[PDB]
Amino acid sequence: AKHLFTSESVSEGHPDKIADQISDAVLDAILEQDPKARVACETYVKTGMVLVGGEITTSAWVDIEEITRNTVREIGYVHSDMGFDANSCAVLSAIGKQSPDIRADPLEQGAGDQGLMFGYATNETDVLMPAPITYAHRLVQRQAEVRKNGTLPWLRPDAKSQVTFQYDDGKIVGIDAVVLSTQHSEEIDQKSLQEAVMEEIIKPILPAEWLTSATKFFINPTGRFVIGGPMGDCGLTGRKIIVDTYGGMARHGGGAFSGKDPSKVDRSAAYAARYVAKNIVAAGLADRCEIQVSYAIGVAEPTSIMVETFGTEKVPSEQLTLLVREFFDLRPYGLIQMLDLLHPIYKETAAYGHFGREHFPWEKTDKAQLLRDAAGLK
Amino acid sequence: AKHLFTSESVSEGHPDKIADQISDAVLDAILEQDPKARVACETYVKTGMVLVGGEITTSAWVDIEEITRNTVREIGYVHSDMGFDANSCAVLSAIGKQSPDIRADPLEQGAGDQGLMFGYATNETDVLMPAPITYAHRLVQRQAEVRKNGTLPWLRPDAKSQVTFQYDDGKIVGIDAVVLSTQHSEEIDQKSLQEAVMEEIIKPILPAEWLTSATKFFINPTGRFVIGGPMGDCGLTGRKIIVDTYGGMARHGGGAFSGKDPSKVDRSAAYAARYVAKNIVAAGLADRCEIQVSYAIGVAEPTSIMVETFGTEKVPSEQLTLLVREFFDLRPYGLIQMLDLLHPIYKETAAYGHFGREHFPWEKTDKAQLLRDAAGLK
Amino acid sequence: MIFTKEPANVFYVLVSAFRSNLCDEVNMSRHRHMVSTLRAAPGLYGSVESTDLTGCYRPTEEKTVRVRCKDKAQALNVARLACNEWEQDCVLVYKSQTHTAGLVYAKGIDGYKAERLPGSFQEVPKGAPLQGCFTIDEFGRRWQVQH
Amino acid sequence: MIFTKEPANVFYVLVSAFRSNLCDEVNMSRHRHMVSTLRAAPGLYGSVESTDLTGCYRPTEEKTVRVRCKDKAQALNVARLACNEWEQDCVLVYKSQTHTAGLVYAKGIDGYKAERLPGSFQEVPKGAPLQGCFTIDEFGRRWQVQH
Ligand SMILES: [Cl-]
Numbered sequence A, B: 001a002k003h004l005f006t007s008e009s010v011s012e013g014h015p016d017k018i019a020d021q022i023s024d025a026v027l028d029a030i031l032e033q034d035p036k037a038r039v040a041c042e043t044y045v046k047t048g049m050v051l052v053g054g055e056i057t058t059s060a061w062v063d064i065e066e067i068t069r070n071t072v073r074e075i076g077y078v079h080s081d082m083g084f085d086a087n088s089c090a091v092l093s094a095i096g097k098q099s100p101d102i103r104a105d106p107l108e109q110g111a112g113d114q115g116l117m118f119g120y121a122t123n124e125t126d127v128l129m130p131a132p133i134t135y136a137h138r139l140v141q142r143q144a145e146v147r148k149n150g151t152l153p154w155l156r157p158d159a160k161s162q163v164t165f166q167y168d169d170g171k172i173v174g175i176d177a178v179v180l181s182t183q184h185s186e187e188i189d190q191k192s193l194q195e196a197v198m199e200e201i202i203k204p205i206l207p208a209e210w211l212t213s214a215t216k217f218f219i220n221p222t223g224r225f226v227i228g229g230p231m232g233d234c235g236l237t238g239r240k241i242i243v244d245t246y247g248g249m250a251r252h253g254g255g256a257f258s259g260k261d262p263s264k265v266d267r268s269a270a271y272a273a274r275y276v277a278k279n280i281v282a283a284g285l286a287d288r289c290e291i292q293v294s295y296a297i298g299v300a301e302p303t304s305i306m307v308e309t310f311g312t313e314k315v316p317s318e319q320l321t322l323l324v325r326e327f328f329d330l331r332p333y334g335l336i337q338m339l340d341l342l343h344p345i346y347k348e349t350a351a352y353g354h355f356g357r358e359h360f361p362w363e364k365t366d367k368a369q370l371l372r373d374a375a376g377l378k
Numbered sequence C, D: 001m002i003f004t005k006e007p008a009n010v011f012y013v014l015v016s017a018f019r020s021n022l023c024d025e026v027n028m029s030r031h032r033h034m035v036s037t038l039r040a041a042p043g044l045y046g047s048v049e050s051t052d053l054t055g056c057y058r059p060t061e062e063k064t065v066r067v068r069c070k071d072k073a074q075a076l077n078v079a080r081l082a083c084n085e086w087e088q089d090c091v092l093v094y095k096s097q098t099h100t101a102g103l104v105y106a107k108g109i110d111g112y113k114a115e116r117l118p119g120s121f122q123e124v125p126k127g128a129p130l131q132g133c134f135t136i137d138e139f140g141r142r143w144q145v146q147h
């Protein structure tokens, strides 16, 4: 039952990821002063301008231009030869700030907006994530690590990766194609770039046993990649949602994460759905689990909760849905309380995926033991 | 095996759909003059401004402001009381136009950019689409139809819908929750709005046998909805990709459709993947079929082709992958040739889903008979 | 399968004016007459959409008319016409999109029995065996109430 | 399962200095001595990561050391040390993330045989029966080469 599956990822220098980081950098700055703020930030990045817009309900004061320039400068855009300069780019702010207002049960607050959220978890990997998306993130993350520490000074922030895994009876048996498009300077020649990228990025990351002679490598297939970033293509917040969550391995609700405060179910419930999906798999209840949570605006309780185990469940499916409702409080404020999301920790989550990194509140498997005991699996 | 599944849709007045229609209105205007143009248009919509940006490689002359104002005016934003006025809104253009250039095989052109594309088709519905997304689109489409023809003059363009279907052994047995948030004028009272919306929108659309006494209706659960559209929330192109394709029923590659010319595989290959997925199901080869096509920038042949039938295939899976490669030319220019995508028909596809409407080139089941004969199913 | 193309919340009546004990020459006259009557009062009976369907039973055959009824009351008038004027035993009535079918026994001047058949009126896949009663449409597709 | 947390492209050697024909008092001395030797030359043998693993066979037991080797050459030196100095029959060597395990027979001064075991070195689910040879780690999780 061999079949090829492909997943891709982009580096922090990609225009669609610059907007995500800028939006979350604004969110983190606000959460430091007013944790209970309401933030919905949308960022548009063009060849020489950054447009930051959205609606904010807070009592905090932030300098949008300073935050934006620092975020871009940390990425590594410092002069116009790269195609974008942090110190000499227009930063327009369309943010509409309001004033917070001032006795019922806080956990009974209805959802601020309707939407669909999907959570996924599989025992395929150690971090309970799909394998193809994890290694796609490793390549671009390795590219940024190598560029910044000075191993390859001629690299530039923009980079994209794409790995095609060859499954067989549900198990990975090799890698069929690796694509690594990276932005460089005009100093380096094309032939030497491919040798350096292959030896210094692809080799240290991917397991050697998967890379056989049949594996095809496409390192900058077109040619020179000198001018990139915002000049090469426009960037908008939430255009890279699939590469953030799971790649193509799991269904997605369609709600962007970056630039949204935890009070919006479009972000917190997706984290919560991943939280309950990871715990179910970590508890041994199922090899793969997919959770769908749906909210109606102005209504506290979710309109629907769906658990799907793809016929890999150790307990009857209707029993799992009872366990999810019993243990996890899925009301919009209950998600914040059970995950402690009111902290400025969202700058780091907008770079190489919101899931799979264990230092996040929603990546903790603490209720796994409780679920296993409740299901009576000993 | 009962389980609730939810899908949602938004009307053409939604801020995220205004940007999609504006982007495709620009695309259709360019395709009328230069069919072989290269268009990548991104639109940002704020409270009182519309920012149209992107890179265009054409010899055509278009008036962006005239196109944008006409598109918004047709939606129904005519004065500031609705929250947005087409005649008095700022229309900034950041479009970077270039000049087309001037002998090899046209079908051997490599993909202009890498990406993942997913196509889905199921025999659940007549149009070979998931049921929940089709009826979600019907409600918002009915809302616009009722508003425009004058049946309910107090309606306003912005509207959102969300239907929760109750499956049982893979078959729909009813509807568990219906949510219909609509923008109205201050003239109508809240109680009379719910009676009119329920009788004039929900009743004519949804089958009467599914709506039992256990069905819960949430019609404007919060309260009055007078000022909406762009003022209520920001809108960006490609933020509603999931509601466009299939809702949550199928996986998505993450590439936006609106504002992209057919030459970009982020749009054409998704149409092509749906085309081959629909034909396989229409041929009786499988009840459900999912197709993944992956391209590497600068490479013609797809890096990977995956067919998934979820164990509902009438022929061995490895035989299906051979049939897909045999019949359908999946090279980036082969998609255009086998679908005739070089026409200004993309204004209509950015409103209520790119799939499921039979008047589209990729919704034709013409190779279904050929596939059935090739598989030897008589 | 959910036939979403069909307009929702309307009723389809499959009705014939045939008998197993009469000359087929007479049956055709009856069928033409019934079609005329249905077309003569579209406010009462609804719109005749097709007249080129064949029925079956168990294998005999008969011409069948599909009438689209806008409401349950119209469907009853069509059923009553068949049962009272054309001596029919029942008519098949199914919903619009779900195709939830049932037999209606509108026999008599007043009152009626409706028996819901278990399942939905669906196309029988080509090559699958036909069992008992089925219907062939104007396109030669075969339809049966499937549980 | 793919253990993506572990650094890729490194080798793990499970090695013991025990025997089934000796006093456990002596075996413990040998085990402490071997651990000292491995730690004494980290350039040659790699880094000792754990010393609190138990082995098994078929049920006897023994203390086992896991050595992380940066390359295949280091792994051979660890294997040679066990086979030549501590009279071991073989050591278990598995890859970093895929945990593709194999038995290495580095017996002799020069040359070596490596036999790839069919499958991967994986955790045995709690409650599942253990069969033949397995390993318990410092956390009491049970590990076996599963086909
Ligand atoms: Cl009925």
Ligand SMILES: [Cl-]
Pocket: D093, D094, D100, D101, D102, D114, D116
């Ligand atoms: Cl080995």
